[PDB]
Amino acid sequence: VNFPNIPAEGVQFRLRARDTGYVIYSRTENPPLVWQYNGPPYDDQLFTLIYGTGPRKNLYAIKSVPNGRVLFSRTSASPYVGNIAGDGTYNDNWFQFIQDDNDPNSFRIYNLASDTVLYSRTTADPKFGNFTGAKYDDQLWHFELV
Amino acid sequence: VNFPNIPAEGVQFRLRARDTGYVIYSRTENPPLVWQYNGPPYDDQLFTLIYGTGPRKNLYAIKSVPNGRVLFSRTSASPYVGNIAGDGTYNDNWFQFIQDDNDPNSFRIYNLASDTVLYSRTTADPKFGNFTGAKYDDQLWHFELV
């Protein structure tokens, strides 16, 4: 089931993991350019969505407020999760927000191209990344409106 | 997780529901034109897949062997599940085969355009159809190679 409370285009938010409470950042210098962060609010944690239409209905690109790059999530080469210019030029820039089957206020950030979800955890490296497999709580996210 | 054993293009199969044991048919006369059936093998139960590429990577159109129509699954207007000419001209012609997380030998037939899965049951009308909501065993299918 698609998440029923996806922000409108233009609406700013952070992506905060339910369990760790960490947020995603997306920046242009100092790799890793996309990772998780536990600390104060900074601009590179801010996103809006580009809504897919036509064949991309129910998919979205996740676009950085300060730098305009969109996220990607792939398994073909490193970095697996990253950012790129182009407003969703690449197929692996397109994400589905899939409501959790138990917690209606959380969702997984699912990539159709790579069949992966994003996760945030505290112990096992890599502590942020993408994953194809079973459902775990560390895959659950919130849109934190700002 | 995408079902790991999706038939090659050109390979014929029936779509058989795990629990009811019914198969899907897709025909051109006698509505309903797409429905479930418990009976002898007929050619209108045979399908092959068209593999999506580009924005349709990991999606598939489900094409009738005898009549060439592809399935659709929609919520805009009746019939909700049906067939139509072409090789997936329409966005609701494109399906994802999503492995069940508990029974690795079964999958759901998921439509990205309509956010629905196909189901087969013996109880309430409509006994075959599409559905947006919780996961149930009546949504589980097999590819039956012929």
mmCIF file of C-alpha atoms in Angstrom:
data_model
loop_
_atom_site.group_PDB
_atom_site.id
_atom_site.type_symbol
_atom_site.label_atom_id
_atom_site.label_comp_id
_atom_site.label_asym_id
_atom_site.label_seq_id
_atom_site.Cartn_x
_atom_site.Cartn_y
_atom_site.Cartn_z
ATOM 1 C CA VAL A 1 0.000 0.000 0.000
ATOM 2 C CA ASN A 2 1.434 3.377 -0.948
ATOM 3 C CA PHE A 3 2.016 5.687 1.988
ATOM 4 C CA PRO A 4 -1.151 7.784 2.234
ATOM 5 C CA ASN A 5 0.500 10.993 3.530
ATOM 6 C CA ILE A 6 3.178 11.791 0.963
ATOM 7 C CA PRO A 7 4.009 15.530 0.942
ATOM 8 C CA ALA A 8 2.864 17.621 -2.012
ATOM 9 C CA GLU A 9 5.426 18.780 -4.556
ATOM 10 C CA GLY A 10 7.373 21.734 -3.183
ATOM 11 C CA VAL A 11 6.812 20.803 0.455
ATOM 12 C CA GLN A 12 10.043 20.613 2.447
ATOM 13 C CA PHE A 13 10.887 17.805 4.836
ATOM 14 C CA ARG A 14 13.603 15.783 6.492
ATOM 15 C CA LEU A 15 13.651 12.009 6.129
ATOM 16 C CA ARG A 16 13.954 10.716 9.663
ATOM 17 C CA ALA A 17 14.283 7.044 10.538
ATOM 18 C CA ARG A 18 11.676 5.920 13.039
ATOM 19 C CA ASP A 19 13.946 3.856 15.254
ATOM 20 C CA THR A 20 17.404 5.454 15.147
ATOM 21 C CA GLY A 21 16.006 8.964 14.829
ATOM 22 C CA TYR A 22 18.789 9.755 12.355
ATOM 23 C CA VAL A 23 18.160 11.787 9.192
ATOM 24 C CA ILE A 24 19.375 11.452 5.631
ATOM 25 C CA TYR A 25 21.676 14.121 4.245
ATOM 26 C CA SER A 26 22.574 14.816 0.628
ATOM 27 C CA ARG A 27 25.516 17.133 -0.047
ATOM 28 C CA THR A 28 28.049 17.875 -2.789
ATOM 29 C CA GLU A 29 31.384 17.731 -0.946
ATOM 30 C CA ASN A 30 33.075 15.384 1.537
ATOM 31 C CA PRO A 31 32.056 11.810 0.708
ATOM 32 C CA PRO A 32 29.930 10.020 1.581
ATOM 33 C CA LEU A 33 27.692 12.526 -0.160
ATOM 34 C CA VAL A 34 24.533 10.761 0.986
ATOM 35 C CA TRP A 35 24.485 9.192 4.439
ATOM 36 C CA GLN A 36 22.711 9.327 7.793
ATOM 37 C CA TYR A 37 23.328 11.883 10.513
ATOM 38 C CA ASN A 38 22.680 12.213 14.216
ATOM 39 C CA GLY A 39 22.914 15.874 15.156
ATOM 40 C CA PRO A 40 21.673 19.444 14.599
ATOM 41 C CA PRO A 41 19.492 20.510 11.661
ATOM 42 C CA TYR A 42 21.410 21.480 8.531
ATOM 43 C CA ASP A 43 20.179 22.425 5.061
ATOM 44 C CA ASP A 44 21.566 19.326 3.380
ATOM 45 C CA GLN A 45 18.976 17.292 5.302
ATOM 46 C CA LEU A 46 16.133 19.086 3.490
ATOM 47 C CA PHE A 47 14.263 17.627 0.533
ATOM 48 C CA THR A 48 11.187 18.001 -1.620
ATOM 49 C CA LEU A 49 9.606 15.499 -4.023
ATOM 50 C CA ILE A 50 9.252 15.512 -7.761
ATOM 51 C CA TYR A 51 6.074 13.581 -8.559
ATOM 52 C CA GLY A 52 6.294 10.937 -11.252
ATOM 53 C CA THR A 53 3.559 10.829 -13.870
ATOM 54 C CA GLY A 54 2.667 8.433 -16.674
ATOM 55 C CA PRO A 55 4.848 5.328 -16.331
ATOM 56 C CA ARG A 56 6.255 6.884 -13.135
ATOM 57 C CA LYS A 57 2.907 7.367 -11.405
ATOM 58 C CA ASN A 58 3.351 6.423 -7.723
ATOM 59 C CA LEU A 59 7.090 7.038 -7.919
ATOM 60 C CA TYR A 60 8.971 10.130 -6.780
ATOM 61 C CA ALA A 61 12.394 11.715 -7.031
ATOM 62 C CA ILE A 62 13.871 13.031 -3.785
ATOM 63 C CA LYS A 63 15.435 16.419 -4.442
ATOM 64 C CA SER A 64 17.823 18.356 -2.217
ATOM 65 C CA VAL A 65 16.753 21.858 -1.212
ATOM 66 C CA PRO A 66 20.262 23.397 -1.050
ATOM 67 C CA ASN A 67 21.885 21.663 -4.030
ATOM 68 C CA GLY A 68 19.072 20.397 -6.241
ATOM 69 C CA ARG A 69 20.500 16.903 -6.729
ATOM 70 C CA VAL A 70 18.193 13.900 -6.538
ATOM 71 C CA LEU A 71 18.862 10.669 -4.683
ATOM 72 C CA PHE A 72 19.691 7.370 -6.330
ATOM 73 C CA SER A 73 19.765 3.854 -4.920
ATOM 74 C CA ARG A 74 21.524 1.194 -6.980
ATOM 75 C CA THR A 75 23.437 -2.046 -6.625
ATOM 76 C CA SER A 76 25.616 -1.853 -9.747
ATOM 77 C CA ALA A 77 28.499 0.208 -8.379
ATOM 78 C CA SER A 78 29.603 2.285 -5.406
ATOM 79 C CA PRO A 79 28.403 4.468 -3.891
ATOM 80 C CA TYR A 80 25.190 2.433 -3.718
ATOM 81 C CA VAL A 81 23.207 5.354 -2.372
ATOM 82 C CA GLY A 82 24.092 8.773 -3.695
ATOM 83 C CA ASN A 83 22.954 11.870 -5.491
ATOM 84 C CA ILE A 84 23.069 13.298 -8.999
ATOM 85 C CA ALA A 85 21.862 16.334 -10.960
ATOM 86 C CA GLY A 86 19.106 16.065 -13.598
ATOM 87 C CA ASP A 87 15.667 16.039 -11.903
ATOM 88 C CA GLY A 88 15.285 12.248 -12.182
ATOM 89 C CA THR A 89 17.025 11.589 -15.491
ATOM 90 C CA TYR A 90 17.991 8.071 -14.399
ATOM 91 C CA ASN A 91 15.611 5.253 -13.653
ATOM 92 C CA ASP A 92 17.293 4.539 -10.285
ATOM 93 C CA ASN A 93 16.312 8.062 -9.193
ATOM 94 C CA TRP A 94 12.678 6.949 -8.711
ATOM 95 C CA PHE A 95 11.287 5.790 -5.385
ATOM 96 C CA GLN A 96 8.032 4.350 -4.089
ATOM 97 C CA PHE A 97 6.929 5.122 -0.510
ATOM 98 C CA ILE A 98 5.422 1.877 0.768
ATOM 99 C CA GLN A 99 3.423 2.050 3.994
ATOM 100 C CA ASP A 100 4.476 -0.388 6.682
ATOM 101 C CA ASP A 101 1.973 -3.198 7.186
ATOM 102 C CA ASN A 102 1.844 -2.624 10.959
ATOM 103 C CA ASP A 103 2.682 1.044 11.610
ATOM 104 C CA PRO A 104 0.531 3.235 9.358
ATOM 105 C CA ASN A 105 2.649 6.329 10.052
ATOM 106 C CA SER A 106 5.886 4.831 8.659
ATOM 107 C CA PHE A 107 7.046 3.752 5.224
ATOM 108 C CA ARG A 108 9.882 2.151 3.340
ATOM 109 C CA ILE A 109 11.817 4.110 0.712
ATOM 110 C CA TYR A 110 11.754 1.588 -2.109
ATOM 111 C CA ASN A 111 13.642 1.793 -5.412
ATOM 112 C CA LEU A 112 11.965 0.017 -8.328
ATOM 113 C CA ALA A 113 15.116 -0.056 -10.477
ATOM 114 C CA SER A 114 17.229 -1.821 -7.861
ATOM 115 C CA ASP A 115 14.550 -3.600 -5.782
ATOM 116 C CA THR A 116 16.030 -2.104 -2.603
ATOM 117 C CA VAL A 117 14.896 -0.186 0.457
ATOM 118 C CA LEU A 118 16.901 2.364 2.442
ATOM 119 C CA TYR A 119 17.800 1.622 6.070
ATOM 120 C CA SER A 120 19.299 3.375 9.087
ATOM 121 C CA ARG A 121 20.935 1.439 11.916
ATOM 122 C CA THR A 122 23.507 1.858 14.665
ATOM 123 C CA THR A 123 25.605 -1.292 14.822
ATOM 124 C CA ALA A 124 26.376 -3.123 11.594
ATOM 125 C CA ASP A 125 28.421 -1.440 8.862
ATOM 126 C CA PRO A 126 27.441 0.029 6.517
ATOM 127 C CA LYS A 127 25.184 1.774 9.021
ATOM 128 C CA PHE A 128 23.227 3.519 6.258
ATOM 129 C CA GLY A 129 22.512 1.977 2.884
ATOM 130 C CA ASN A 130 20.183 0.023 0.687
ATOM 131 C CA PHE A 131 18.962 -3.544 1.022
ATOM 132 C CA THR A 132 17.098 -6.272 -0.824
ATOM 133 C CA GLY A 133 15.557 -8.720 1.609
ATOM 134 C CA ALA A 134 13.330 -9.227 4.613
ATOM 135 C CA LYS A 135 11.427 -6.469 6.361
ATOM 136 C CA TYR A 136 13.094 -4.966 9.420
ATOM 137 C CA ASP A 137 12.175 -1.990 11.567
ATOM 138 C CA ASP A 138 15.381 -0.159 10.629
ATOM 139 C CA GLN A 139 13.864 0.325 7.153
ATOM 140 C CA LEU A 140 11.058 2.559 8.502
ATOM 141 C CA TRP A 141 11.022 6.287 7.800
ATOM 142 C CA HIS A 142 8.940 9.406 8.445
ATOM 143 C CA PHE A 143 8.449 12.592 6.465
ATOM 144 C CA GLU A 144 9.354 15.265 9.020
ATOM 145 C CA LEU A 145 7.749 18.430 7.671
ATOM 146 C CA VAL A 146 9.643 21.675 8.225
ATOM 147 C CA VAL B 1 11.775 -8.590 -3.095
ATOM 148 C CA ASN B 2 11.047 -9.477 -6.706
ATOM 149 C CA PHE B 3 10.140 -13.114 -7.286
ATOM 150 C CA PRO B 4 13.424 -14.820 -8.188
ATOM 151 C CA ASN B 5 12.049 -17.248 -10.796
ATOM 152 C CA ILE B 6 10.079 -15.166 -13.271
ATOM 153 C CA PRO B 7 9.711 -16.998 -16.614
ATOM 154 C CA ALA B 8 11.863 -15.959 -19.555
ATOM 155 C CA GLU B 9 10.146 -14.086 -22.361
ATOM 156 C CA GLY B 10 8.582 -16.543 -24.789
ATOM 157 C CA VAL B 11 7.998 -19.137 -22.062
ATOM 158 C CA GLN B 12 4.326 -20.139 -21.633
ATOM 159 C CA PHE B 13 2.613 -20.598 -18.288
ATOM 160 C CA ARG B 14 -0.633 -20.584 -16.383
ATOM 161 C CA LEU B 15 -1.100 -18.332 -13.366
ATOM 162 C CA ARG B 16 -2.447 -20.562 -10.624
ATOM 163 C CA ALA B 17 -3.541 -19.322 -7.226
ATOM 164 C CA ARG B 18 -1.751 -21.154 -4.418
ATOM 165 C CA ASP B 19 -4.761 -21.664 -2.171
ATOM 166 C CA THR B 20 -7.830 -21.957 -4.413
ATOM 167 C CA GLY B 21 -5.904 -23.740 -7.149
ATOM 168 C CA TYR B 22 -7.842 -21.703 -9.718
ATOM 169 C CA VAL B 23 -6.171 -20.281 -12.820
ATOM 170 C CA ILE B 24 -6.554 -16.934 -14.536
ATOM 171 C CA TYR B 25 -8.042 -16.853 -18.023
ATOM 172 C CA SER B 26 -8.036 -14.030 -20.539
ATOM 173 C CA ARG B 27 -10.466 -14.279 -23.452
ATOM 174 C CA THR B 28 -12.293 -12.076 -25.973
ATOM 175 C CA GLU B 29 -15.945 -13.087 -25.582
ATOM 176 C CA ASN B 30 -18.338 -13.934 -22.736
ATOM 177 C CA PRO B 31 -17.752 -11.473 -19.886
ATOM 178 C CA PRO B 32 -16.016 -11.538 -17.537
ATOM 179 C CA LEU B 33 -13.190 -11.616 -20.064
ATOM 180 C CA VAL B 34 -10.561 -12.018 -17.336
ATOM 181 C CA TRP B 35 -11.485 -14.126 -14.327
ATOM 182 C CA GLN B 36 -10.555 -17.280 -12.413
ATOM 183 C CA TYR B 37 -11.423 -20.838 -13.411
ATOM 184 C CA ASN B 38 -11.418 -24.306 -11.933
ATOM 185 C CA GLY B 39 -11.623 -26.759 -14.815
ATOM 186 C CA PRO B 40 -9.856 -28.278 -17.831
ATOM 187 C CA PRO B 41 -6.836 -26.685 -19.511
ATOM 188 C CA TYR B 42 -7.751 -24.248 -22.267
ATOM 189 C CA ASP B 43 -5.472 -22.023 -24.293
ATOM 190 C CA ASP B 44 -7.018 -18.841 -22.897
ATOM 191 C CA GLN B 45 -5.302 -19.723 -19.611
ATOM 192 C CA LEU B 46 -1.867 -19.487 -21.271
ATOM 193 C CA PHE B 47 0.348 -16.432 -20.991
ATOM 194 C CA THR B 48 3.832 -15.186 -21.712
ATOM 195 C CA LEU B 49 5.555 -12.063 -20.388
ATOM 196 C CA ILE B 50 6.790 -8.916 -22.042
ATOM 197 C CA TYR B 51 9.710 -7.633 -19.960
ATOM 198 C CA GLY B 52 9.608 -3.954 -19.138
ATOM 199 C CA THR B 53 12.745 -1.905 -19.721
ATOM 200 C CA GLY B 54 13.693 1.708 -19.034
ATOM 201 C CA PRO B 55 11.083 3.112 -16.629
ATOM 202 C CA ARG B 56 9.394 -0.316 -16.661
ATOM 203 C CA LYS B 57 12.398 -2.323 -15.460
ATOM 204 C CA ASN B 58 11.115 -4.926 -12.960
ATOM 205 C CA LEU B 59 7.620 -4.690 -14.411
ATOM 206 C CA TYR B 60 6.020 -7.056 -16.923
ATOM 207 C CA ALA B 61 3.032 -7.196 -19.231
ATOM 208 C CA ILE B 62 1.058 -10.430 -19.103
ATOM 209 C CA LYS B 63 0.131 -11.418 -22.649
ATOM 210 C CA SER B 64 -2.440 -13.991 -23.762
ATOM 211 C CA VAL B 65 -1.057 -16.723 -25.986
ATOM 212 C CA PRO B 66 -4.189 -17.239 -28.121
ATOM 213 C CA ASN B 67 -5.454 -13.646 -28.431
ATOM 214 C CA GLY B 68 -2.450 -11.441 -27.717
ATOM 215 C CA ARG B 69 -4.237 -9.108 -25.302
ATOM 216 C CA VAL B 70 -2.401 -7.991 -22.169
ATOM 217 C CA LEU B 71 -3.914 -7.826 -18.691
ATOM 218 C CA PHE B 72 -4.769 -4.612 -16.906
ATOM 219 C CA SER B 73 -5.633 -3.932 -13.287
ATOM 220 C CA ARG B 74 -7.191 -0.590 -12.462
ATOM 221 C CA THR B 75 -9.475 1.194 -10.012
ATOM 222 C CA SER B 76 -10.751 4.018 -12.254
ATOM 223 C CA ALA B 77 -13.699 2.192 -13.827
ATOM 224 C CA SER B 78 -15.220 -1.239 -14.448
ATOM 225 C CA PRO B 79 -14.130 -3.805 -15.332
ATOM 226 C CA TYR B 80 -11.323 -3.427 -12.816
ATOM 227 C CA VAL B 81 -9.345 -6.403 -14.102
ATOM 228 C CA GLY B 82 -9.436 -7.000 -17.830
ATOM 229 C CA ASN B 83 -7.527 -7.263 -21.046
ATOM 230 C CA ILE B 84 -6.649 -5.035 -23.964
ATOM 231 C CA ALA B 85 -4.795 -5.122 -27.256
ATOM 232 C CA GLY B 86 -1.215 -3.959 -27.552
ATOM 233 C CA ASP B 87 2.044 -4.820 -25.878
ATOM 234 C CA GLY B 88 1.426 -2.720 -22.811
ATOM 235 C CA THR B 89 0.445 0.603 -24.344
ATOM 236 C CA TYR B 90 -1.213 1.578 -21.084
ATOM 237 C CA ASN B 91 0.468 2.171 -17.750
ATOM 238 C CA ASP B 92 -1.947 -0.135 -15.882
ATOM 239 C CA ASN B 93 -0.738 -2.991 -18.106
ATOM 240 C CA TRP B 94 2.500 -3.283 -16.093
ATOM 241 C CA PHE B 95 2.888 -5.669 -13.157
ATOM 242 C CA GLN B 96 5.520 -6.442 -10.546
ATOM 243 C CA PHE B 97 5.883 -10.007 -9.203
ATOM 244 C CA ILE B 98 6.618 -9.574 -5.516
ATOM 245 C CA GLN B 99 7.839 -12.612 -3.584
ATOM 246 C CA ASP B 100 5.915 -13.405 -0.432
ATOM 247 C CA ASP B 101 8.052 -12.839 2.669
ATOM 248 C CA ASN B 102 6.947 -16.102 4.325
ATOM 249 C CA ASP B 103 6.358 -18.504 1.418
ATOM 250 C CA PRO B 104 9.302 -18.012 -0.940
ATOM 251 C CA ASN B 105 7.614 -20.125 -3.620
ATOM 252 C CA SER B 106 4.735 -17.684 -4.139
ATOM 253 C CA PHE B 107 4.308 -14.109 -5.270
ATOM 254 C CA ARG B 108 1.783 -11.328 -5.559
ATOM 255 C CA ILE B 109 0.783 -9.849 -8.915
ATOM 256 C CA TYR B 110 1.119 -6.155 -8.143
ATOM 257 C CA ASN B 111 0.103 -3.226 -10.351
ATOM 258 C CA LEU B 112 2.165 -0.061 -9.892
ATOM 259 C CA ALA B 113 -0.348 2.217 -11.607
ATOM 260 C CA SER B 114 -3.262 1.204 -9.372
ATOM 261 C CA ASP B 115 -1.411 0.027 -6.225
ATOM 262 C CA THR B 116 -3.389 -3.237 -6.256
ATOM 263 C CA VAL B 117 -2.733 -6.969 -6.124
ATOM 264 C CA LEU B 118 -4.766 -9.710 -7.791
ATOM 265 C CA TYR B 119 -6.598 -12.223 -5.592
ATOM 266 C CA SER B 120 -8.506 -15.497 -5.925
ATOM 267 C CA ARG B 121 -11.033 -16.630 -3.318
ATOM 268 C CA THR B 122 -14.133 -18.827 -3.025
ATOM 269 C CA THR B 123 -16.134 -16.657 -0.662
ATOM 270 C CA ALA B 124 -17.408 -13.141 -1.323
ATOM 271 C CA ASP B 125 -18.079 -11.474 -4.668
ATOM 272 C CA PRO B 126 -16.124 -10.535 -6.561
ATOM 273 C CA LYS B 127 -14.348 -13.859 -6.066
ATOM 274 C CA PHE B 128 -11.549 -12.756 -8.404
ATOM 275 C CA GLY B 129 -10.331 -9.177 -8.522
ATOM 276 C CA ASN B 130 -7.859 -6.584 -7.395
ATOM 277 C CA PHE B 131 -7.250 -5.137 -3.951
ATOM 278 C CA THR B 132 -5.346 -2.420 -2.101
ATOM 279 C CA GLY B 133 -4.694 -3.381 1.487
ATOM 280 C CA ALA B 134 -3.302 -5.980 3.829
ATOM 281 C CA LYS B 135 -1.491 -9.129 2.735
ATOM 282 C CA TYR B 136 -3.525 -12.322 2.595
ATOM 283 C CA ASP B 137 -2.845 -15.839 1.353
ATOM 284 C CA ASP B 138 -5.550 -15.469 -1.317
ATOM 285 C CA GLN B 139 -3.199 -13.036 -3.077
ATOM 286 C CA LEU B 140 -0.520 -15.708 -3.628
ATOM 287 C CA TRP B 141 0.211 -17.078 -7.092
ATOM 288 C CA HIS B 142 2.479 -19.538 -8.870
ATOM 289 C CA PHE B 143 3.839 -19.588 -12.410
ATOM 290 C CA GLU B 144 2.796 -23.013 -13.710
ATOM 291 C CA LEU B 145 5.053 -23.825 -16.645
ATOM 292 C CA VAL B 146 3.400 -25.586 -19.588
#
